[PDB]
Every structure is written in structure tokens, then in C-alpha cells.
Ligand binder design. Structure first.
Ligand code: CA
Lengths: 225, 224
């Protein structure tokens, strides 16, 4: 058993709830408000969670923030994706907020959510394990490709450390497939693609001004766009 | 490695931007020149894809779906590779090298800085042509199109190309057991910058100031 994987499992945050307003009737704006409020709260949890990634808090505060400002949506989406693995054509944003095709349509998110489901579909083929999820989440952060990084060697060392952990996991638990680690890494492009679509989508919603969004969420949107 | 070899042999001939000397140096000349170049690059890429082992065994539908998804990645990766031995300059073609000031003029600073971000990373790694051509092929196979019919055959093509990279790195780069993975980890940035370029050139289409050829426009519609 790999030490870094094990830490990451222990570091895995607690379940968060969307908690939509029952007094407010089902609309396209309720959904988007609900989702943005949820993302805002996830963010706080991700920022805290990143500190437990071995080597991360040893980076400069500037670099820590640069990686988080680049990778947060990837991490958010990867969480949604993992929660949705044992479901069919449905996205578990939270245990109390599962959206199907009709609900995605209403919310104006069919294109985004279909892309997230593309990601789910691929991980279901591979039978993604929780050990691999958490490690990929950490790699996504370390490999976020921020333009504003100061200590490039320290960030690359963090990438190597987390990459090695994945290689060691797959070498030990998945001998039947010598290329599984690579297969996992090859899902990261789609993760990035759908993160970017989600950021641009939720930024357009900001500009339309119909949906209230909290300070932190708006701050992390500005940074990426 | 047989696959790597097949891909080196398959590498296309160099293509030229050939800007118009009678037309004075403007933001529009540059963009026109680059769109013309891209158009002609595409023809080349479409022909090149046929020489990737397994590719033309796919349905014509799926062949087109991958190409419609990956073409800009392949285009950019070519620019990136040509630019490795340069500093802060993008060799779009041997007769069309753009520096920071030219990028700024053309309205491409953000896009081109992201491409240079890609160059910067492959310079660190001392990217070899063997790796470039394989990654080009992997990018196509791993293009993540919505519209794929024969999923298993596409995955098999990913596996075959991935295996070639893994074998190459296992033989040539034993000093680094994670080089293949490092190479794979460059693909998200390639994807990111592909998408920026697509959205950027689509906006130029909408502005209607720059003439664009039929094929280029067709491949932009598909992605956006
Ligand atoms: Ca050739």
C-alpha cells in the first residue's frame, strides 16, 4: 500500500449538500442559484483539502493560489463525476441534487452536463476506484498549467511525486493492465475541456445578472476567464 | 518500434505561409495569411491521418468525428514542434515566424503566449521527433468526440498508440521511468490551447473582416 494514496483517502472531504430552497418553485434560476451556492461552498472545502496534498503547502502562497485558481473547476467536476459512477445518465452534483437530462435542459446546461457524462461514461468503462479518483484530483491540481507559476521546478516535483504514486498504485493493484496509469492520465484532457466549458458557461450567467453568486465563486471565475 | 517508424515516414512535407508581398503588413494580412495556411494544413492533416495504423479501418463516420475534434490540436502541435529551437517566437511556417510584437499586432498575444507555454514545456523535456509524431497520433485517437459509434475500436487505437509511446520511452529513456506519463500530461494544455484557438478564429469569422476558405470554416463550425 502506497503512503501518498492513503493520505489522500484520509484527506477526502466530507459530503456537502446542495440544499435547494423548498419555498422557491422549480425554475432555471433556482437550479443555477443552487448550483452556484454549492460550488461556492465546495470551493472552501477544496482550498482546505489542497493543504493535505503532500508537498503542496510547501509551495509559496502565490504558487498555491495560482494552481487552485487554475484547477478548482476540474476538481469540482471530478467530484461530481465520481459521485455519479453508479448512476445512469444522471449527475450527482450532491446526494440531494441529482440532475437528469430534462433538468439539465431546463437549467440551460445540456451541453455542459452531456460533457460531464462523457467523462463519467469513460470512468465507468475503466471501473475507476476511489484511490485513483483522489490521486487524479491531486494530479489535476499539480498539473494545472497556470501561467503565473514562480517556482516551476517545485511544481514539476509535485507532479512527479503524485504521478509516481499513481504508477505505484497501478503497478501493485492492477498488474493485469500495464498501461492503466497512462489510460487514467489520458482522461485529463477531457476533464480540462469540460472545466473550461463550465467556467465560460458560468461566467456568461454572471454577465446576464439574473443569478446571485457568492464572493468566492465569482473571484475564482474572474481568475480563470 | 514499428509504429513510431511508420509515423516518422508518414510525417508530411513542410508547407509555406507565402504571405502577399504586394499587400502591406497589417492585422488583417496576418490573420488572412494564417487562415489560408491553416486551410492548407488541414488538407495535409486529413491525408496524414490515413497513415496512422488502424485509423482508416474505422468507419468513415468515426474517422471524420476524430478529425473534426482533433485537427486544431494537431495543427498547434506542429507549430509547437517547429518552434522548439527558437526563443519566444512561433514558427507557424519557415517563412512565417511571429514574435511578441507581431502577435500583439495580429490580436493573438493571449493565444500565442499559450502556445509558447506549450513550447516552454517541451523544451524542458527535450521533446524528440519520435515523441512528437506519436503524441500527434495519440491526440487524434484521444480526441473525445461526442459522436463516436464504434467506441471499442477507437479505444483500441488509443491503446495501440499509447503502447508504442510506452515501448519507445521504455527503450530510449530508461533514465526516466515516467517520461511517457510526463508526455501524456502535456495533452491537457494542448487541448486547452486548441479550444482557445478555435473560439478565437470563430470570432474572427463572425467579424467578417478576414476571408476564410471553405474547409477551414467547415472544421470551425464542427468544433464550436
Ligand atoms: Ca513522409
Amino acid at each position: 500500500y502506497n503512503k501518498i494514496v492513503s493520505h489522500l483517502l484520509v484527506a477526502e472531504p466530507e459530503k456537502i449538500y446542495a440544499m435547494p430552497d423548498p419555498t422557491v418553485p422549480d425554475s432555471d434560476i433556482k437550479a443555477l442559484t443552487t448550483l452556484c451556492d454549492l460550488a461556492d461552498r465546495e470551493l472552501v472545502v477544496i482550498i482546505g483539502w489542497a493543504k493535505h496534498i503532500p508537498g503542496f503547502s510547501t509551495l509559496s502562497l502565490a504558487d498555491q493560489m495560482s494552481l487552485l485558481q487554475s484547477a478548482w473547476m476540474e476538481i469540482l467536476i471530478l467530484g461530481v463525476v465520481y459521485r455519479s459512477l453508479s448512476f445512469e445518465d444522471e449527475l450527482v452534483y450532491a446526494d440531494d441534487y441529482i440532475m437528469d437530462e430534462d433538468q439539465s435542459k431546463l437549467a440551460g446546461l445540456l451541453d455542459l452536463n452531456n460533457a460531464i457524462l462523457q467523462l463519467v461514461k469513460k470512468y465507468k468503462s475503466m471501473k475507476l476506484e476511489k484511490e485513483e479518483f483522489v490521486t487524479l484530483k491531486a494530479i489535476a491540481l499539480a498539473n494545472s498549467d497556470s501561467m503565473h507559476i514562480e517556482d516551476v521546478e517545485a511544481v514539476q516535483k509535485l507532479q512527479d511525486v503524485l504521478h509516481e504514486a499513481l504508477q505505484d498504485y497501478e503497478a501493485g493493484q492492477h498488474m493485469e493492465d500495464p498501461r492503466r496509469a497512462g489510460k487514467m492520465l489520458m482522461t485529463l484532457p477531457l476533464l480540462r475541456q469540460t472545466s473550461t466549458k463550465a467556467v465560460q458557461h458560468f461566467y456568461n450567467i454572471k454577465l446576464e445578472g439574473k443569478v446571485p453568486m457568492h464572493k468566492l465563486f465569482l473571484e475564482m471565475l474572474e481568475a480563470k476567464v
